Design a protein around this ligand. Sequence first.
Ligand SMILES: Nc1ncnc2c1ncn2[C@@H]1O[C@H](COP(=O)(O)OP(=O)(O)OP(=O)(O)O)[C@@H](O)[C@H]1O
Ligand SMILES: [Zn+2]
Lengths: 133, 24, 31, 101, 50, 45, 184, 196, 104, 443, 96, 138, 85
Amino acid sequence: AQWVPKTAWKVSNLNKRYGPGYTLGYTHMVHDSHKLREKLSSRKGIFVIDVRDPGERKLNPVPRSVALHHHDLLSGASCPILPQQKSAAELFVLASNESRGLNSAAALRRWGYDSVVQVDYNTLVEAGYVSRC
Amino acid sequence: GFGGFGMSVYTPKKDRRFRVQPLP
Amino acid sequence: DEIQRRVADRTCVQEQSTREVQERWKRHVVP
Amino acid sequence: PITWQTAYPGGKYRIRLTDMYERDPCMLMWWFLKDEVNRHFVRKLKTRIAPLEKAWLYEDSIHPHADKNPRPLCWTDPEVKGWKYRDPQFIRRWKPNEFMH
Amino acid sequence: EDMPLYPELRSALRQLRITTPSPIQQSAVEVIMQRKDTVVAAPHGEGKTL
Amino acid sequence: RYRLFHPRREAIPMHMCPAKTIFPLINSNNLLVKTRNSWEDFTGR
Amino acid sequence: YSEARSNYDGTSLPAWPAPGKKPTYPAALSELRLPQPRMRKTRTEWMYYHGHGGCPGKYGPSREIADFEYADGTPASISGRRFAFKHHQDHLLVQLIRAAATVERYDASGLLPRIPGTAEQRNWDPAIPLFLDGTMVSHVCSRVVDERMGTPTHTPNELANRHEGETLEANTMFATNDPSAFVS
Amino acid sequence: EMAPELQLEYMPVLFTRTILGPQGGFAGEERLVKLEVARKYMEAGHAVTPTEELRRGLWCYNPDTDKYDCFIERNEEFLDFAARKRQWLDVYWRVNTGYLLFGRQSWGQGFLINCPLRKRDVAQKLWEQYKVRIDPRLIEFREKDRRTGIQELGHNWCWLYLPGAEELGINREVYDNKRVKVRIHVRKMNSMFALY
Amino acid sequence: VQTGSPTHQREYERFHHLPGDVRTRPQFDFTFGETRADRVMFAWRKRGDLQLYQMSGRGETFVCYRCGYPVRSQLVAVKADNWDYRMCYRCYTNTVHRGMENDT
Amino acid sequence: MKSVFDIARSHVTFPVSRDGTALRRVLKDWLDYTECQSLQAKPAFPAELCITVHPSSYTKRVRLLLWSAVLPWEVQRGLSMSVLEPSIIPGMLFVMSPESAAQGLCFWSGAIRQPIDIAFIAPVEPPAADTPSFSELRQRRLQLSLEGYDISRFFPDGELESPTVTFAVQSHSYLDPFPDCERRYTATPEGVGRGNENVRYVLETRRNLLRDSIRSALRECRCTHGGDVEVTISLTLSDELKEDLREKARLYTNYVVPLEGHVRRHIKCLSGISPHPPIIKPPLPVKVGTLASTRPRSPMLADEAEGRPTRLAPSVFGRHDAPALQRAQQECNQLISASALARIPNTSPRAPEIPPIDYEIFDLCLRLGLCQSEAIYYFYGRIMREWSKELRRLRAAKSHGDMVLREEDVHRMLRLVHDPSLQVPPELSACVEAVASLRKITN
Amino acid sequence: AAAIAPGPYRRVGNIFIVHCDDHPFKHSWEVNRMLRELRLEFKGQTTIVPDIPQVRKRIWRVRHIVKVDVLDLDEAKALIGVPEHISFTDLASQLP
Amino acid sequence: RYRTAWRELLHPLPVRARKMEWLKRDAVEENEEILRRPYYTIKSYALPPAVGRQEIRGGMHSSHSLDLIMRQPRRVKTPEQLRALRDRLRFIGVTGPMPQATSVSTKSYTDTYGSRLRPRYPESWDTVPPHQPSRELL
Amino acid sequence: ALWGWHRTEAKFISRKQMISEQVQNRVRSGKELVGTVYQKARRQPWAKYNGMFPYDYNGPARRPAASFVDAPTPTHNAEVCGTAY
Ligand SMILES: Nc1ncnc2c1ncn2[C@@H]1O[C@H](COP(=O)(O)OP(=O)(O)OP(=O)(O)O)[C@@H](O)[C@H]1O
Ligand SMILES: [Zn+2]
């Protein structure tokens, strides 16, 4: 059958009274932590980018994630570090503020990575990706 | 180019040098 | 085809039997 | 228009191409040859007159220059140019190995 | 009313029976309130002092 | 046409003056500089 | 005898392919980021591609190869122009080296901002995404030229009076994230 | 989080009637407004002192009845919707208030320009001197300029289509909620600012 | 400018560098047959109340009623066939571009 | 057995413009026909696939029963939740719009039972007919044609009436079913016919149909190679299939366009959009001008009169002081300074009243391809916001230790998410899954 | 392959090869001052500069009289016959 | 179509000059697109340098011999090997003493022939030596 | 080449005009029977317009020719073709 384009769903962002950002519908930081362990044990790689403060990532030292800044991610200085397969690869953004998480997600979408999901440090601890202690 | 209004008109020497052929 | 379509549309006074018998013979001989 | 000046006052003769053709058809070709020559040689009377005498104009098709055996010079005009046309659509010929793999 | 003035200053304009800024009072008042060196020049009687 | 479009790297070709001219031993591990400082210090032919 | 020299070591890519195999051809259209208009490479672009400086005797073999050798093999002599050209090559080399070293020092110190461009470029280009967190005559001339270059146009006084310290806020209500609208 | 010396020049102000401008806001908005303009608003009657009861609920001006009979309860969704409507109205006001300035080269004193403009250049200068980010797809030239864009020298005007009109309900106060007319003045400038 | 003979370069091609109606072919050609008394060689389309004319010989200096300057040129714009009110070509092009050819 | 024409003849009576319940019933009956009826129950028609062999001719005719899919819901559905086989071979024909064929055609294996073979066919004319003269002939005959089907979208070259036109294949691909519903799942034309405007027909059929046909055709090819042989494929549609395609295109252009207009009007209504001596002289509407008055002073001035406001500008009727001007302003309810007139708009501060969301129509639009983009643009943000607020409420209740959402609506949205025939954005999918997990609601 | 590249990460800047294409003396004194800072005097001169914000600002000011090409550090190490285990700070410290 | 006809009538530049002006605007847009690039770029050791490149096709460009090396993988794949090459890397013109505890019998050329003396070099068009070592300093 | 009197009665015309003539030959077959002096004197082109169209200056409009790339290679290209009869 004919494939409805994925970009056809971007027209809802043009809604003025109900837009994504200008009462919030992120739904990424609140996802169930059960599927996170399954996706973990299936992928078993480095696909989590943490975008937060240096003091915060020192206080919560997630070893497997890669530390980046949202300004850097939007500028695109980390293109060779990115998985280079925009279709198959999926990314997990570890951010403190929902604002920074959404900005990093928008930067990844602009660079071509549509499969990006936000995850909190608490959700990561509850799932077992960080393996706190 | 083609001078406008304010620019004075100057008559140059006609190009008499030999020109190559305009092949298609 | 073009000339017959134009002449039919511009005449508008004819009988479809003559146009039908030829296409019927075509259906009977060609395929 | 084809215009020229004579020594008499107000003698600015102005004739049409039709007038010059009904007078003498060779005059038009000679005038255009003179123009094309003076385009590059106008300083020296020698360099602007001597070439013209090498042209042998003839109104009709007959000419007495059959002994010199003139070769039929071939020349291409700079106007020939093929503007882009629509790519014609045709059926593609496939291959058994292409259908196999 | 379009220029920002304090209410106690509004009463001073009413006490002086002032009702409309003269041309030199229209272009000079807004400049002084921006704290810039100004040379208020106008003929005599155009309300320069105020 | 005087509006040329080409990578200006081509305007300065480096194929003829590699690092072996500025540092003769840069291909090896030892590093040494043998350069011509200016055009005034010319002993002559 | 003769010298066939293209680079410093006289090496070049294989100019002739394998017998029967398809040969490789350069790019005929000029290096233009836009597909239109398709323009054939001029002779100066061809020289720049082959390695010259756009002139027959500006760079490349025609300038680096010697002109005469003695019959017994004794080479030529050094000329003033030869020494000047060698110094010019070394000057280009040291320019590149010092530029790279300055970039490395800036990177090590941290003076390379993550935000691309400059303030003027960010105020001038909408395609740039919005980021959200001795003598004194030389100095005064630099300040004057900065004041005259920066801020080419100003917001009209009806929207925001620049003297009253009023500046408009950036708005992204109708903007789009995809750069197709700005690149097409 | 402002500095105290800077905050001394501002005062918290609740807006009763929606006002457009760099020191404006929407009906039922709390903002740090400068002293002079805030005093002007409070004297005109468009502003109120932000008390706790007023932060809870406010009365606002009604355009249909021309009286402050519209009681409004400040809620999160109301604040979001009113902020979006204020953004739309501010974009419209910016693009419909003043001129746009273009400066390019033109050899001689001719009437047409050397290099005609395009939607990309229009959007660039819009973001530059209006601080409004829009995509070039919303800029639609005139019937004569659909071919080569803005080419004349002097004064021209283009159409800019704003999609978000009927969702927020602006068709009453605005002249035309569908589109807006951007007046663009093109001139000859010096080399450094002409650049073409 | 004059860069050729009238056989190749027409007389109305001298002002080809100036912008406006001269870059088009004139409608009337009085250069053939008898010569006019005022030595006018071409006349363009009558735009509203203004019509352009090209003289022959050295430029006759006239006074444009729009700018007020004495103008020496071969191009003259006559208003409503009244040869007392003339216009230089520059004022003519500006009047047309503004759309004042019917009013002025 | 059941026919789209019978469905339309039944829906003739339903008054759509007067009752929204009637439009909802129309959409429900269309969804019923689309998802509750079998592809074998839907009518088919025969067509012949010919294969000519050029040696260096042999013809191979195959009987094909083709189901015609021209409607948007049928096209977006395809061979989803349907089987081809429960001498003649089944198949499906898809007709694309010219605007959609201009872009890269992309098909996907959506909820198919058997692996499918896809062939991108297009109408081609002999070079003697591809001259621009016959092109202008066809354009004139189509612009003069009185048929119902839209020429700009349906058959812009006239491949149904022209005798010399042949439907030839230009690209070949295969679609494999996903492991959940039963190795590439995406099909796109490649090589000849890639990104062309004439490649507008898609033939889906049994996997390796062309492979088996070429195997059966290459009989003398073995000895021809033993002692460089090309193959060409074409399609011939029978007269009944031509008539079916024409009638379906006509029914589309005469039924769905008013239906699409009514759906858009209903969506706007659900979103809340409804179609519609003094000292100071206030603005007045402009006076209607006569012929000579509306005639500009110059044909070049005829362009400036394009953009003119329909209202005059306000003014004052004398020279007065500031208090007099302010009193005149407050008495006439009109401001003089254009700056203030622009900065102070008479705007209703209240938010527009909006009736609740209609998940049923939101699902119907997505499942029937009718005004899909409009329905998304008008309801996706609202649905996401309401579901996220409900999720926040449920998480607050969970952390602590009647509801706005209806259980039927939650079930419908869960069906929409878990339906493999459609692709839902990951945001909405995960949101609905989390809300269902928190509310303990399944299926 | 679809995973983020592991291992230690290094920064790689850029350098600008700027070639003048129009007569600078024809323009005003400010653009001429900027080109003089960029070390360009006549038409047809090519220079090499870092990618610092100052140079970026200068090139943004004179972007209509010069054409610029970008070369990263690895691209420069490939263009000039210098191994990869040798940085540029040492080369700058070694040159006289 | 009076307005567009008059516009087509008057033009300040001919067609070729307008073509060159469009080429100038294209060069300016290319300069701006080039300046819009970021400052640095985070790269990895093992992966080739030409993996993060953002970008008239099917032909060989002048940078073919360079993009070959850019596409081939890197040699030094770890900071361990990097420092194992650096600690062996040595300078000569460095101002100051140099380690000699490796071999005692070897003497550097500076210590052997002083500083004001250099070996005689073959001076020809092919190879040029540095001149005036006294002027070589400061 | 002209077959009749005026330049508009050209011996070679476009296919659209040719189809127009073909349909007129059948729709108006009655007016062909009689030749009246009225029509004879009306046919005289002494009053018909003869002006230079834009194509009379720019040449006939360029249009692509029917390509025959699909034609097989001539197997007897060296042989000479004979007369018709
Ligand atoms: N806005 C106003 N409306 C009416 N009267 C005014 C206004 N402003 C000032 N005046 C009157 O004008 C008078 C003269 O003002 P002022 O002294 O400023 O004039 P001046 O220009 O300073 O004269 P001079 O230059 O001779 O000193 C004052 O007495 C004052 O009452
Ligand atoms: Zn004048």
